[PDB]
Design a protein around this ligand. Structure first.
Ligand code: ZN
Lengths: 397, 98, 397, 397, 397, 133
């Protein structure tokens, strides 16, 4: 594996640092590394593909080496080189792709393809170098074992979930109390509604709560917390819990009272914020708990008083809400986020080559399904597959 | 101490190499591939056409090959046959080392 | 075969005693043995597979020894070794598995695979050593023709059997007398019931008996015997013997009277225990006979008297029972038990590779079916197959 | 860490192979290894303890070597040795215990104590030897990343859970339908009850189902499956779901109909058994699903017919059940089981020394709490802590 | 004594490491040890047996040594060896058995037979070696004086005891209150019953308690504690305390209230658990105290209310219970358990040879009788006898 | 301060370009830089912590150099190196954290800790390198 990596930074730091004119010296340490490779190769043969609409190409080697004591590289030098690189390019592509679809369960964390199973071989280790590509940097540390980790923008930790829970309801659905929410990606919006505007509630206050359990711990999270859930601030006709009928939601929004956000880790409060809107830091957590209340306004102008009668029908439904967005965070496990193309690369290669559904990943590499049941096997396969996608993107985008 | 079967060459390919696939002491092992290579890297077109087969900057002054040629030697001091042997042998080797 | 064994304790006592640190002198007697192997191998071609979902991988050899004589093992020494072991590991696996699916009636207690048939060869015999693995210890002693022996906690000697025998019955099933039981694994529970509470029985006592014939003799058995059969102490609706209707069992439990357990061997009483509950030893037996009685209580308080009228309907059914569990025992034949993974290993490898049903073993290696008709052929094949599973578990779990 | 190991097999294979009599030759390879140690040590100072009711003791090293001089060990040789071992014994104890209490989230896996952090040092590695102790064998393979593996008996995979689910209920709780169960350790008992005996059910059959999700995958499991749930075969007075009242359960047992057990892995059926009672093998699964039915008896004798009227009150409650026990299995993660003393050792040392609750483990090392939220951190700490307990038990029990 | 040991690991590590093939350098350290023995022997005459139906055979020696030349072991080498081992095998058997019968009283912890009294001799001590057999490891540490210890699965600490105690009773036995239990092996089941369902009890709660005093302290015990005593959950007709009549028990089960388990050591609470079911650790105790209550349900549905009237007759008897099982534990004294064959071996050899009852052990080596009056003499004899059984099982099973 | 920086790109461009099987050429310019450091260090003792819940781990120095010999890095070379880096890692962490809390109003832009105030020292400046972060 680590093998694979090199094969690339080799070419990039190559197809990049080797141009018409450059003084020699800044490549001496480079040329060398390069050649070393060629040697190890030439002689051994390779097999690529064999599944679905995946071509089956064969490969051989025997390419001259490279000059040493020159000075300034003449055009002629380049072309006689680019022609030798373009075989490795078109190669690696066919290599990544081949091991970017195979999956195993017992040991689906390691190499699979007849291409790679031969790379982990010992006579090959003669290449590994310059491991500064964020992903490999993390692959290794995981191998030896330790505080791994990655960087994500608007991470994708919440499987899509859009639903409601009626804590008080009746057939006519004319006096409900409960919550409705949308958990998706890095965002949570939750609203608590009470058709009665806490008219008969103790202290004229109705308590609400929304708990979200992450499938993986997030550390060093920068989070935006804002009052109100715009998504649940408009009139809706919704299906009943049993699907037998539809109810009407006609919200009027009040400020959430006694807002308390807790970021817990294994049941323990790690961070807690009381009514603090704006930017907050949650340093280590696997659960978010949002508690907020609807408090019936003790003083109301006529226009307001008119919305909240002492008796039904309740036509304006008091609603309070919160919006929470994880802008950035670190996770010890790979995840999809709003900036990295890994998930899209893996999903795209599989779709383009009509790769059959396997035993590990959900059909279509569906993110919601994947994160909902993020088993150790799916994570090991995902990491292997994401690391390969990142190696590929150094050369082919 | 390795292949006490001394060897057996008829005429395969690069009788000097082949040893790499079957030698357990990396130091020893690099020598082999490097020596079985350094093909006099026959590829040069300088100062306006000049096919003048060059060779490793490595060799050049980066020299180390030497340092490695030695380090590999620094760990060859062991048994097998009469004593008047290793004694005489390794002693010579050291004279290369110093 | 014995060959095979070594190949492992070789690797275990290897991948274990060979680590960064220790002095050479800790493995001198070991290193040697090792090398010896490599030699014998080098050059000979191999093949494994050709059945169901089992790949056909070929293995070629050409390896050198270990002359690097350095007082302390330097890291570099290890890695150059582990890389050579990982070919033998991934090998042996593919070897065990190959001979762990093929069966034979014309005699299976012998090599079958094109892999092993070549191992029993003479030129390979130059390898055996350290046979302290309980299973091989027993393989040898057997192929020489002599008393064997194994160890089991909660052995699996009783094929599943759950039934009843009505000694007195009538269409309405309102006045039955008989026994019902569950024989499974290492346990027996049996209840004797008499709806009439021995009202018209001689001495107001109804005799019961339960006989269980083991398919193999057990020696040195530690057994727990307790009064009562909890499994048959609750109300049940049961199918009639002919399957045409259902009867009602409404037990009330009394202490079993004149309990006598006999452990017989070839019809002879070897051990006999009279009303002794707790821990008892049965030193050598192929049959267990449990005799117990229901004695109508000679003196009854009103509440008791009310359960047992002089005339039908009999609504409370007098029941007496026994529970017997074989905690541990020794058997000259391999058996499944509650601790060893042999049966599970063999069954699992066959299931994973979709191995077709063969001529010896019942479909799915079904234990009940196997022990019910434990023929000599099934036992020889089982022992071969269990011994291989044990060789495999020294390296791969 | 690996360091630690040696320190023991050193002493055991020592305090065992070294006694008044033996001929030198059986220990030449041994003596050596030993001395090597002494050297590396002498001079260095150690800090053991400093938390809770744990004695803080200092240790200096300045000891002689061994008399390779004599032939057959004379008594005098032993005593002058045992006196030097008894400092290492009483030492290691104080060493294990010290690192068998500390915990940390981020880097929970690695060593923590001022005693061990100094052992992983490089100048010590000169000690490793004979790593055949099942646990270390597995520690190593894990730091390299491979298909590890442990062996258990009546494993402890199910957190204690004893509850019920009423699928049909009403205030009087006089005509209920649902299931009740007990999941604990390696056993599951589940009963499905229908007070109406499927009188108005389609095909007069009521379907039941019980799903149990393991926190870790079990492979190579030998399992006993039996019909009936004895635990739920007797009359009970139970608290209602809301705790406001109590209901009456008066079971009468019928054979479970169309029993189907599925052992699934990531949603896929790996093993399925239809009405097979006795011993069955589940080779790889993270979920068990038990489906069974209550079928109203189509033919009933008067006594049976009387239990099941066409109209309420329903006084005899039809119940069907299953019992499943995992006798043995392999898990890639450490777990408590019915034979190993690891959990008990760790829990006992912490209790004896009044070790304060830490950030990783639940109070009292509570097994149910631990397995219920078996996070990666808890597992890494548990494995470290279990491996140390096993090293300690080689010398101190 | 220690002598004896060697004689075996000698043969096992012999009949095992000496097969057709292996190189000499795999046993050099072994061969030696062996020969040494032969010498010491030849010339000394022995005698065994004499008591009961145990033959009396004589033994003489003058056996040749073993070539220390040949590099590879040729078949011919083995056979000329096995023939010499088979005299030692058939010997040792006759040796173990002889000292596995005699018993003393004071100083009955030592050798007895004319065979062994000669072994402890000094001129024979020249044999000891590899003492890694759990039992000898412990014999030594004891001789000197130290903290011994063994590992047991489902140990056998509770002498069989099945009884009841009526705290409130009357001639008709129609309104009883008390407890009934079964203590056996490693398990305890206890039920508390109150026919009146605490109708006139303070706080409508009846307190129960069950105390069990172990004959030996158990340390590092892993224990399963579950609510309910299935064994006492069914209808029974039981004999009255005076044996003059029989009473009726018709239980209905309620959850045990305020469960408290205390593991005490010398009257001190070492571990205490309040209502914690599942797996718990008891680190050091000689007594178990189970306290639990029956609390009359404050709220009852009609069906429940009907079972518990304000006045007699009381027809449904409220019962609460607990089940406790010691899965594993360590004891400083030898004990029988569910896995070891020691007790069974000793008991079996005595039974097979019709050994007369002696002055120390109860007739038939009855476990209940033995553990009930586990005197120092019985323990010393048991340990001697168990250690010999373990030495024998290394060669003969 | 700038000092501090180097200490890292040193390790990263280290724990990264030094793998189980590569060429010296990739690091000649690197190895050097590295050693230079070790020297300047060895002999000087350090202190960190002393506040809230921050432990006070103490550090000494006395580490060997680097095999400037080889061509291809033999596994054995790595391990004998990683073991020396893991002291600098676990070190720097305890260093950053220490000066990542002490605030100062007046001359706030500058160094604070007894750890860093000693780093800005002159005898250390002998280390700066690749400042492209
Ligand atoms: Zn068990």
């Amino acid at each position: 594996m680590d093998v694979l990596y090199s094969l690339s930074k080799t070419l990039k730091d190559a197809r990049d640092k080797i141009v018409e004119g450059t003084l020699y010296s800044n490549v001496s340490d480079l040329i060398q590394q390069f050649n070393q490779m060629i040697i190890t190769m030439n002689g051994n043969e390779f097999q690529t593909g064999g599944i679905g609409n995946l071509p089956i190409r064969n490969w051989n080697f025997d390419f001259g080496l490279l000059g040493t004591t020159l000075l300034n590289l003449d055009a002629n030098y380049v072309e006689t080189a680019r022609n030798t690189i373009d075989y490795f390019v078109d190669f690696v592509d066919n290599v990544c792709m081949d091991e970017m679809v195979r999956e195993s369960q017992r040991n689906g964390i390691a190499p699979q393809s007849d291409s790679l199973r031969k790379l982990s071989g010992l006579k090959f280790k003669r290449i590994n170098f310059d491991n500064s590509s964020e992903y490999i940097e993390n692959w290794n540390l995981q191998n030896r074992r330790q505080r791994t980790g990655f960087t994500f923008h608007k991470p994708n930790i919440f499987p899509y979930s859009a639903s409601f829970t009626l804590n008080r309801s009746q057939p006519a659905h004319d006096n409900l109390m409960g919550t409705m929410w949308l958990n998706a990606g890095s965002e949570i919006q939750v609203a608590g509604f009470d058709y009665s505007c806490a008219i008969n509630a103790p202290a004229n206050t109705q308590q609400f709560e929304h708990i979200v359990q992450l499938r993986r711990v997030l550390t060093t999270a920068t989070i935006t917390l804002l009052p109100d859930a715009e998504r649940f601030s408009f009139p809706r006709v919704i299906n009943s819990a049993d699907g037998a009928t539809t109810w009407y939601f006609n919200p009027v929004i009040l400020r959430p009272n006694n807002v308390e956000v807790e970021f817990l880790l294994n049941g323990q409060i790690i961070n807690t914020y009381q009514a603090r809107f704006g930017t907050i830091i949650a340093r280590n957590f696997d659960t978010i708990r949002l508690s907020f209340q609807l408090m019936r306004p003790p003083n109301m102008t006529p226009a307001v008083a008119a919305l909240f009668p002492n008796a039904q029908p309740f036509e304006h439904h008091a609603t309070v809400g919160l919006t929470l967005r994880i802008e950035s965070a670190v996770c010890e496990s790979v995840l999809a986020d709003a900036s990295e193309t890994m998930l899209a690369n893996v999903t795209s290669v599989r779709q383009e080559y009509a790769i059959p559904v396997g035993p590990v990943f959900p059909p279509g590499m569906n993110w919601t399904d994947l994160i909902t049941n993020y088993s150790p096997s799916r994570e090991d396969n995902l990491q292997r597959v994401f690391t390969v996608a990142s190696i590929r993107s150094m050369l082919v985008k | 101490g390795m292949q006490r079967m001394h060897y057996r060459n008829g005429d395969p390919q690069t009788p000097f190499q082949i040893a790499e696939q079957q030698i357990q002491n990396f130091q020893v092992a690099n020598w082999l591939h490097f020596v079985n290579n350094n093909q006099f890297r026959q590829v040069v077109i300088d100062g306006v056409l000049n096919q003048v087969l060059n060779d490793n900057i490595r060799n050049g002054h980066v020299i180390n090959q030497l340092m490695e040629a030695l380090m590999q030697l620094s760990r060859q001091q062991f048994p097998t046959m009469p004593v008047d042997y290793k004694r005489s042998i390794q002693r010579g080797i050291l004279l290369l080392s110093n």
